[PDB]
Each structure stands twice: as C-alpha cells, then as structure tokens.
Amino acid sequence: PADFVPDSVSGMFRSHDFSYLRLRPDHASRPLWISPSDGRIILESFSPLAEQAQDFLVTIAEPISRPSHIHEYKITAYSLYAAVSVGLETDDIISVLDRLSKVPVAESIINFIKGATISYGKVKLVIKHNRYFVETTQADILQMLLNDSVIGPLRIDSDHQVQPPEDVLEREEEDDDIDAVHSFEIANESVEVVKKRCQEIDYPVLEEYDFRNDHRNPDLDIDLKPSTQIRPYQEKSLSKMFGNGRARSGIIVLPCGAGKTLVGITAACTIKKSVIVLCTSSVSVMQWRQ
DNA sequence: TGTATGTACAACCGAATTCGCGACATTGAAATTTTATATACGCGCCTTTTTTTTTT
C-alpha cells in the first residue's frame, strides 16, 4: 500500500562467516577493521582519521559502540538515506573506509554505502520559479511528475512563477528534488496526493528543502527577540536546520519536555514570515502556551 | 475486554455598569434699622389721685 521499509530498514547487515569471509587485506595496514559481514566498524585508537572516520560512519550508519579503544558499527537505512542525504562521496567514503578499515569493505556493505551515497532518492522532482513542481533533473523524474495525479494533475500548467513558485511551490513542495530544471508550477492545495501517489508507485526522490522559497510575504507580527530559553542541543539542531545562512526547516526529532518548541519559535522568527504552530491536542496547545 | 480521550453543539444564567430629581448653599439684594422736627390724632402705660371697702 503505502509503507516504506527504507525509512525503517535499520537493524540489519550484521552477519558474516569465517570460511567465506576472509581477513581484510587492509587488516595488516588499515587503521580501522571494517567487519563487513558483522556490519561492525571498530574504530580503534590506531585510526588517525578516527574523528573523520567517526563522523562519516555516523552519517551513513549509526555507531552502536563508541568504546575508548574502538567504536562499534551499525546499519541504519534512515542513516543510509541520511548519510545518502549527508552528501559524502559514496566512493570516497568507501575507500577511506577501505584503506582505513582493515577488514575489507564488504561487498554487500560497499553496495549499500554507494547505494546510500547516490540512492536514498533518485527521483527527479523538478521545481520552477523557486518552488516545487512535477518535473525532474533526471528524465525518469519528469515522467514521475507529469504522470503524477497530484504532481501533474495538481500541477498548474505554468512552468514556473517567481511569485507562484514563491507562494504555492499541489501544496508547498519546499521538499522537492533538484530545481532549475524542466517542470511546471503546482497548485496551492494538496501535496498529500503528490506524496500519496509517489507513495503508491515507490518513487524515492532525491529531495531538497528550499528554505527561502520559505518567503511567503510582507513580514508578520513576529517579535525577533531571542529571550526564549536557549541551550546547546537546540541551537546546533538549529544550526543544522539553519544550515548555511538562512533558516531551513528540516526534520528534527525533539522531545516534549526539553524545550522542543524553542527551535520552532526561533526558526519562525528568523524567517520573519507567517508561521503556524500545531501541537497534539488543543488542551495541550494551552498547556504548551502556558 | 475496560477504559482514556478530543471535541460539540446547544440552552442557561447573573454580573457589572451609567443615566437625572432633591438638599441646600450660594451670593445677590431689599427691608429694617436710628436720629431730628413740626404736625394729631389714638394705640398703651406710667403714677397719682381719689374712692371704696374693711376692721377695730
């Protein structure tokens, strides 16, 4: 129907042998030892790029162990998509893995990392006039958008408008794929159907988030004061969602009871633009507002 | 299998809020106030006078 293992596919790739699985040729001269069958990547004290290695593993996968001697390696599809969305060169990570990881890069592990680096979305969701539309940087993308009931049918025929792509981006498609390619401006209504049809037909689309196509108007009555409590995970989570230069809303999985709304109020203020806040239930809306 | 939950849509209720007549106080003023003097009357009232009455 509309369920994707790729988001929740984390929890596998830890099984190897000893007869078929050979000691990694880098095992003699390799700062790490990538156990590809066990999916474990032990980052011992001998890795000089352990900080560089530690960050790369955290993107493509989840480091289960962070021991003082060596770390531990786990596989995460959301990490794989996140490490795919990380943007590190799939080949470049593998080789520094291969050279660093004494255990040779596993064949299945090597494919997933490259599959991370490039896949985790090869979709072609084009955008017009700084907005989202039914198009694609790649051709199979324009076909997906045009043949889309929500992307195409919900897409206005106009190729792109500075204001329409600005305003409408058939809802807000501020999460589309590569823009500045062939596409048509989509309406102001219903990206559920856009996503509910890329749902039904399994279109993993290499998506972005165009955060000042979070423009949306003359500036609202927002008091851009940072007097709301600021404490360090929120800001670097903000620094992650503020990214380079200007406020991008990402997905930032935050706890209710540790100042969750605090990042939202800042990002809402930072854009200096109209923003709505949605909480669980209305009674919690007052509690949270209280 | 018992229960916790968000949200509704409709009739009930009392709570809190702003308008002019009466009380006098106001200053404005006239009236009254005191005095001389002739006039003459008619108020009342003073003392004295005379009369009457009582008691021895």
From Swiss-Prot:
Disruption phenotype: Essential, it cannot be deleted; epistasis studies suggest it is involved in damaged DNA excision repair. It is found in: Nucleus. ATP binds at L254, P255, C256, G257, A258, G259, K260, T261. Present with 825 molecules/cell in log phase SD medium. Belongs to the helicase family. RAD25/XPB subfamily. ATP-dependent DNA translocase. Component of the general transcription and DNA repair factor IIH (TFIIH) core complex. When complexed to CDK-activating kinase (CAK), involved in RNA transcription by RNA polymerase II. May have 3'-5' helicase activity alone, the TFIIH core however has no 3'-5' helicase activity. Also involved in transcription-coupled nucleotide excision repair (NER) of damaged DNA. In NER, TFIIH acts by opening DNA around the lesion to allow the excision of the damaged oligonucleotide and its replacement by a new DNA fragment. Component of the 7-subunit TFIIH core complex composed of XPB/SSL2, XPD/RAD3, SSL1, TFB1, TFB2, TFB4 and TFB5, which is active in NER. The core complex associates with the 3-subunit CTD-kinase module TFIIK composed of CCL1, KIN28 and TFB3 to form the 10-subunit holoenzyme (holo-TFIIH) active in transcription. An additionnal subunit, TFB6, plays a role in the dissociation of the SSL2 helicase from TFIIH after transcription initiation. Interacts directly with TFB6. This is General transcription and DNA repair factor IIH helicase/translocase subunit XPB/SSL2. The gene is SSL2. The chain holds residues 101 to 422 of 843 of the full protein.
